[PDB]
């Protein structure tokens, strides 16, 4: 599926790559890459298939966030992913795991088309480029690596968000995740019996101590 | 309704009592009082209307810590205490509410005479005393005070788990809740909040943590 992006090169790659084992030594671009200046970054990452009560709370989240001059970054996957970029709009920045010629999932071609035009998508990829095994997990650092802090909605174990989250660990990005029933989002359960990650227990308290921080 | 209980008087008033500012100067008790001899005794109260969600584990710790030689400790109300009380038989204390010749709330008969006969039922109040809104309140402190730990699965705001809650904290118990949704127990959502309360993440190693910190 092409995308039809007439995408440029971005001068300076960002400062909050630095932290990398391994930064990225050339990033494409569409649209504002002004985004890339914003004093608050979060993170929004999850599972496909989040139920109406992770979805309903990550909509909030994201709109919130956005409403208040944040930047929400993400991978544009299915799930969490596009409902947390298409509810910052226009101010979401989208880490693409395929090159910008490209659209990837094929099924947000919506959503993604609307960031290219009113946010910003960056790929560490220059052409011709579908993803790979490798490439999401490539794709994941760099949106861990460029947000501020992390949150994860929901999450099973063993996936990609629970990758995602050992690497906010070692890069010491502040990791919080949405109260679960138990049995229900295990990823994000486990992170809070281990001590990895804090509990948003208040909407309004968590965006608000989190913008009063940067603001 | 009566309950038909034979009861008597406490011997001795436990030394857990001590921390109260006001302990009760005599305990009148029917059934099995060596249940006041344990090593680990767990308070497990909360709404009288639990979700589903709540009710199952709830069933399940309680059940979990009784096999394992814990007593369950809790108030016979409606809901959570009862439902942990039935789940934990006979390994179960009760404080009553009331004096030990009635029985409340009247619907929990069953499992309140099961408690009787196999668990443990205290009061403060002697004979012909009906619960009033500020007996529920002092029975609470002897509920929380008694026990080495507080469990509250589910409960609201301004409710009496709450009052509980303080309890806990003032009298230094640790205190321990179930995962909840935003908005489904904002009770026990604020004590996770407020650092207050830890929450149960992993059901049973809350329970093998809880058992080997008290060497059972």
Not at 38 to 44: D, F, G, N
Not at 49 to 76: C, D, F, M
Not at 87 to 107: E, G, H, Q, R, V
Not at 141 to 150: K, Q, Y
């Given at each position: 599926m092409k995308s039809h992006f007439q995408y440029s090169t971005l001068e300076n790659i960002p400062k909050a790559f630095d932290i990398l084992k391994d930064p990225p030594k050339k990033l494409y671009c569409v649209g504002d890459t002004k985004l890339l200046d914003t004093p608050l970054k979060v993170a929004i990452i999850g599972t496909r298939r989040p139920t109406p009560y992770s979805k309903q709370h990550t909509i909030t989240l994201a709109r919130e966030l956005a409403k208040n001059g944040a930047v929400i970054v993400s991978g544009g996957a299915l799930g969490v992913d596009i409902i947390a970029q298409e509810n910052a709009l226009p101010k979401t920045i989208m880490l693409s795991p395929c090159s910008l010629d490209f659209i990837y999932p094929t099924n947000n071609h919506k959503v993604i088309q609307e960031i290219a035009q009113?946010?910003?998508?960056?790929?560490?990829?220059?052409?011709?480029?579908?993803?790979?095994?490798?490439?999401?997990?490539?794709?994941?650092?760099?949106?861990?690596?460029?947000?501020?802090?992390?949150?994860?909605?929901?999450?099973?174990?063993?996936?990609?968000?629970?990758?995602?989250?050992?690497?906010?660990?070692?890069?010491?990005?502040?990791?919080?995740?949405?109260?679960q029933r138990l049995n229900e989002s295990d990823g994000t359960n486990e992170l809070l019996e281990k001590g990895q990650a804090q509990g948003i227990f208040n909407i309004q308290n968590f965006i608000n101590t989190l913008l009063k921080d940067y603001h």
């Amino acid at each position: 599926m092409k995308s039809h992006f007439q995408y440029s090169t971005l001068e300076n790659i960002p400062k909050a790559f630095d932290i990398l084992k391994d930064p990225p030594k050339k990033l494409y671009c569409v649209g504002d890459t002004k985004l890339l200046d914003t004093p608050l970054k979060v993170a929004i990452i999850g599972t496909r298939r989040p139920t109406p009560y992770s979805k309903q709370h990550t909509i909030t989240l994201a709109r919130e966030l956005a409403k208040n001059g944040a930047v929400i970054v993400s991978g544009g996957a299915l799930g969490v992913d596009i409902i947390a970029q298409e509810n910052a709009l226009p101010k979401t920045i989208m880490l693409s795991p395929c090159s910008l010629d490209f659209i990837y999932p094929t099924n947000n071609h919506k959503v993604i088309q609307e960031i290219a035009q009113n946010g910003l998508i960056l790929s560490e990829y220059e052409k011709d480029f579908m993803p790979i095994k490798g490439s999401f997990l490539a794709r994941n650092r760099l949106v861990i690596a460029l947000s501020d802090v992390v949150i994860i909605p929901q999450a099973d174990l063993k996936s990609g968000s629970m990758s995602s989250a050992r690497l906010a660990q070692k890069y010491q990005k502040p990791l919080f995740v949405l109260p679960q029933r138990l049995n229900e989002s295990d990823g994000t359960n486990e992170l809070l019996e281990k001590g990895q990650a804090q509990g948003i227990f208040n909407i309004q308290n968590f965006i608000n101590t989190l913008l009063k921080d940067y603001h």
